[PDB]
Design a binder for this molecule. Structure first.
Ligand SMILES: CCS(=O)(=O)c1ccc([C@@H](NC(C)=O)C(=O)Nc2ccc(C(O)(C(F)(F)F)C(F)(F)F)cc2)cc1
Ligand code: NA
Lengths: 12, 252
C-alpha cells in the first residue's frame, strides 16, 4: 500500500 | 488560481514557452551533450553476454530502479510546470500516474542512437540484445522502435520540453475532478508548443508525431509484462522493487 507521490508533491 | 486556467493572450503564450523550456532544462536528468558524447562508448560482446547471463529478477530490479530515477525527474518537472501545482492533489496524482511513464519514454529518445540502434544504459550504449534476460523482447523492441521513430524527427530540447508538458497535461485522463481546469491548461500548452514550432518553421512534424494510442499501448504493455514478472517472482517485487515504481505500475 505504498504512497510516495503525495510525499514528493508536498516536499518543498 | 492560475493565468493559464483561462484564455491566454499571445504575450502570455510566449511567456509559457519560456517557462516550460526552463522547467525542462532544470529537470532533464542527463544533459544532451553528455548523452551525445557517450555515443562512442558501447558495451563489448563480453559485457553484452554478462548482461544476458544475469538472472531475470536481477535484471527486472535494475531496470525498475533506473525507471524510478527517471520518473523522479518527471515528478520535479511536473511540480515546476505552470498551473500543475494549482490543480488539486487528486488531479496531480491522476496526471502523474497516467503520464509519468509516457514522459520518460519520450525523454528516452535523447538517449537513443538511431545510427546503431542502441540506448544509454548503466554508463554505456547497448542494443536491445542487452535486455534479453528480462523475458519481454516484444516490449523492448516496441520501445526501441518508438525511440527510433522519435529520433527521425530530430527533436530539439525545447521541442521535447513542450511536447512532454503536453503528454502530462491531458484532460482526457480518467479520474480528473477539475476537468475544465485541465482542459484550459492543456489548450494553452498546445498553443505554446504550436507557437514554438510556427516560430522555428517546424510545423511539418505535427503530422509526424505518434498517436496517443501509441504511448498508451507501450504503457499497457509495460504494466502487462510487470504483472507476468510479479506472478513469477512476487517476493522480488514486494521486497526489492522501488515503492514509487509499485505505486505507479502495481497499485501500491
Ligand atoms: C529519460 C531521461 S534521460 O534521457 O536524461 C536518461 C536516459 C537514460 C538514462 C539511463 N541511466 C542509467 C544510469 O542507466 C537509463 O536509465 N537507461 C535506461 C534505458 C532503458 C530502460 C528500460 O527499462 C526501458 F527501455 F524499458 F525503459 C529497459 F530497456 F531496460 F527495459 C531503463 C533505463 C538516464 C537518463
Ligand atoms: Na535519438
Amino acid at each position: 500500500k505504498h504512497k510516495i507521490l503525495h510525499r514528493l508533491l508536498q516536499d518543498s | 488560481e492560475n493565468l493559464y486556467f483561462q484564455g491566454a493572450s499571445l504575450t502570455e503564450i510566449e511567456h509559457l514557452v519560456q517557462s516550460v523550456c526552463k522547467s525542462y532544462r532544470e529537470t532533464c536528468q542527463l544533459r544532451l551533450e553528455d548523452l551525445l558524447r557517450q555515443r562512442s562508448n558501447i558495451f563489448s560482446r563480453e559485457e553484452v553476454t554478462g548482461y544476458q547471463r544475469k538472472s531475470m529478477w536481477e535484471m527486472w530490479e535494475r531496470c525498475a530502479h533506473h525507471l524510478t530515477e527517471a520518473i523522479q525527474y518527471v515528478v520535479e518537472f511536473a511540480k515546476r510546470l505552470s498551473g500543475f501545482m494549482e490543480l488539486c492533489q487528486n488531479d496531480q496524482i491522476v496526471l502523474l500516474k497516467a503520464g509519468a511513464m509516457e514522459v520518460v519514454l519520450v525523454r528516452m529518445c535523447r538517449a537513443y542512437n538511431a545510427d546503431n540502434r542502441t540506448v544509454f544504459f548503466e554508463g554505456k550504449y547497448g542494443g536491445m540484445e542487452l535486455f534479453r534476460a528480462l523475458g519481454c523482447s516484444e516490449l523492448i523492441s516496441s520501445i526501441f522502435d518508438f525511440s527510433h521513430s522519435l529520433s527521425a524527427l530530430h527533436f530539439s530540447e525545447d521541442e521535447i520540453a513542450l511536447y512532454t508538458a503536453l503528454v502530462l497535461i491531458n484532460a482526457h485522463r480518467p479520474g480528473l475532478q477539475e476537468k475544465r481546469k485541465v482542459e484550459q491548461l492543456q489548450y494553452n500548452l498546445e498553443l505554446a508548443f504550436h507557437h514554438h514550432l510556427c516560430k522555428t518553421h517546424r510545423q511539418s512534424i505535427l503530422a509526424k508525431l505518434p498517436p496517443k494510442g501509441k504511448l498508451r499501448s507501450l504503457c499497457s504493455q509495460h504494466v502487462e509484462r510487470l504483472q507476468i514478472f510479479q506472478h513469477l517472482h512476487p517476493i522480488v517485487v514486494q521486497a526489492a522493487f522501488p515503492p514509487l515504481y509499485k505505486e505507479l505500475f502495481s497499485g501500491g
